Amino acid sequence: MTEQSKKQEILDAFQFRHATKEFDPDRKISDEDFQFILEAGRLSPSSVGLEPWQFVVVQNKELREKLRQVSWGAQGQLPTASHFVLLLGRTAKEMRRDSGYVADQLKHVKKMPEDIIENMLKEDGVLESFQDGDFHLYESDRAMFDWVSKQTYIALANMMTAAALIGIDSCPIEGFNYDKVHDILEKEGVLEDGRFDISVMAAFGYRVKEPRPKTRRALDQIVKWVE
Amino acid sequence: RGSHMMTEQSKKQEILDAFQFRHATKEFDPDRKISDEDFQFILEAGRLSPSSVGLEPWQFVVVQNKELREKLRQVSWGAQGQLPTASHFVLLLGRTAKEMRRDSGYVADQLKHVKKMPEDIIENMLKEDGVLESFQDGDFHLYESDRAMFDWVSKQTYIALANMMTAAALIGIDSCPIEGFNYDKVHDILEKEGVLEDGRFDISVMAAFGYRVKEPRPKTRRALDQIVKWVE
Ligand SMILES: Cc1cc2nc3c(=O)[nH]c(=O)nc-3n(C[C@H](O)[C@H](O)[C@H](O)COP(=O)(O)O)c2cc1C
Ligand SMILES: Cc1cc2nc3c(=O)[nH]c(=O)nc-3n(C[C@H](O)[C@H](O)[C@H](O)COP(=O)(O)O)c2cc1C
Numbered sequence: 425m426t427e428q429s430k431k432q433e434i435l436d437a438f439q440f441r442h443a444t445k446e447f448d449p450d451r452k453i454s455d456e457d458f459q460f461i462l463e464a465g466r467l468s469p470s471s472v473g474l475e476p477w478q479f480v481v482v483q484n485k486e487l488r489e490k491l492r493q494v495s496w497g498a499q500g501q502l503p504t505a506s507h508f509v510l511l512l513g514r515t516a517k518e519m520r521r522d523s524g525y526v527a528d529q530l531k532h533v534k535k536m537p538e539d540i541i542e543n544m545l546k547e548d549g550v551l552e553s554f555q556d557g558d559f560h561l562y563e564s565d566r567a568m569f570d571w572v573s574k575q576t577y578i579a580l581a582n583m584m585t586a587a588a589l590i591g592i593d594s595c596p597i598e599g600f601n602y603d604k605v606h607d608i609l610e611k612e613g614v615l616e617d618g619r620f621d622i623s624v625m626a627a628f629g630y631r632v633k634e635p636r637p638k639t640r641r642a643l644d645q646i647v648k649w650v651e
Numbered sequence: 652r653g654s655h656m657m658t659e660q661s662k663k664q665e666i667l668d669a670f671q672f673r674h675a676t677k678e679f680d681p682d683r684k685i686s687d688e689d690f691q692f693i694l695e696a697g698r699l700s701p702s703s704v705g706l707e708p709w710q711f712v713v714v715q716n717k718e719l720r721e722k723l724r725q726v727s728w729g730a731q732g733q734l735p736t737a738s739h740f741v742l743l744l745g746r747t748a749k750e751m752r753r754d755s756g757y758v759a760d761q762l763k764h765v766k767k768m769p770e771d772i773i774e775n776m777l778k779e780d781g782v783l784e785s786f787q788d789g790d791f792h793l794y795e796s797d798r799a800m801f802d803w804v805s806k807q808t809y810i811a812l813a814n815m816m817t818a819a820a821l822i823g824i825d826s827c828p829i830e831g832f833n834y835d836k837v838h839d840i841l842e843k844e845g846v847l848e849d850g851r852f853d854i855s856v857m858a859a860f861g862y863r864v865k866e867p868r869p870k871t872r873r874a875l876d877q878i879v880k881w882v883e
């Protein structure tokens with residue numbers, strides 16, 4: 425398979441993916457294919473390798489309906505998706521140099537050596553100097569959470585792209601009332617005693633209609649070169 | 652169906668193999684350049700990325716100039732190996748807060764002329780307390796501050812970042828996403844350079860591309876049963 429053919433195959437998948445408004449309600453993604461989609465999320469990169477996310481697969485019909493009542497952007501997708509995913513981000517209290525989540529992730533998952541960890545997590549060490557001085561994430565809980573949320577959008581993109589590469593449609597979803605969705609998930613136990621908060625949603629399934637032609641700004645509008 | 656099962660599994664494997672191949676590459680081969688065709692393909696993956704309300708609130712700046720790369724390196728603790736050696740270095744900019752409201756020219760022209768949104772739909776989208784405002788203000792609280800609106804834009808840019816990295820890896824090209832820079836100092840450099848276009852853009856995140864010179868340590872992630880929960 426020539427490398428030019430491979431590139432065309434990949435662009436074809438980027439063209440195939442679209443913001444699918446409704447899915448076939450009688451065609452379910454296989455367990456294997458869906459596990460593959462989740463793995464694309466799991467393997468995604470994240471800042472400082474902290475993987476500050478959780479993927480909640482909402483198949484429960486009552487919870488889908490509770491969400492649909494407060495998600496203006498998901499009216500066709502929530503009832504019809506084969507699989508529906510809440511991308512949660514770790515909350516601000518989970519992400520600082522003295523949070524237990526950070527220490528356990530770096531030590532037990534990333535296998536960071538003890539000396540490297542101490543320089544990473546010391547006062548005015550690598551993590552704090554970056555979070556505070558460089559990126560100003562101590563300015564509020566929201567600033568820290570929105571940075572977490574950016575990391576979840578990498579996982580979002582990779583899940584939709586993986587799906588599209590094997591012919592499965594998706595729709596990313598922000599069209600929901602944050603306060604009401606937060607309250608629903610908090611009351612349901614889904615946010616795990618304030619460890620998580622909702623970032624973004626994603627539906628997956630098979631299209632029912634062909635979409636309108638894709639539109640984007642031109643490459644020469646959006647790319648600048650500094651030579 | 653056995654033979655079909657193996658072909659489907661092998662295609663999935665190819666994709667997983669690219670996800671395993673991609674890693675946060677710390678330095679690149681200073682002599683081996685990505686082809687013009689291959690790099691345009693990487694950019695196209697960025698261009699074809701989805702974005703909230705289809706507003707594509709990004710600009711990609713390819714910084715090949717050695718002097719500017721070095722200015723950025725002086726204030727980018729996370730990019731010490733990547734800036735001097737990368738084949739291609741990309742600044743992902745996001746539109747700033749006043750570009751992104753319902754009656755901003757950027758939004759109006761993007762939805763009318765690129766998205767071709769018909770008149771009745773665009774009216775409902777962009778009127779006072781219409782679809783966009785109700786979402787931006789009431790739902791997501793983006794009117795709260797310039798930073799809230801910019802960070803929402805910046806999230807969209809991370810979609811393009813992820814897709815550029817994955818496209819590159821699928822054709823054997825390494826990359827590294829880069830946040831390790833001082834925002835204030837980088838902002839000022841780009842502002843003086845003219846790259847932020849009279850305040851219409853600000854820096855979101857960086858990305859280096861090229862060919863590895865060393866093999867990475869084994870990739871590590873949390874287990875699937877740690878990060879995935881089912882509500883059935
Ligand atoms: C948004 C973002 C910013 C990052 N910033 C940097 C950086 O400035 N320098 C760096 O060497 N690595 C950076 N990383 C790399 C992460 O440390 C790395 O992706 C993570 O530890 C997982 O490792 P892998 O990408 O090798 O699988 C960044 C990653 C992401 C997603
Ligand atoms: C983060 C994000 C959130 C989105 N929210 C919604 C939504 O709530 N409902 C919806 O129908 N489409 C939603 N969209 C789809 C966008 O309108 C769509 O991706 C964009 O217009 C480009 O079209 P395409 O994905 O068909 O190429 C969202 C897209 C993204 C990236």
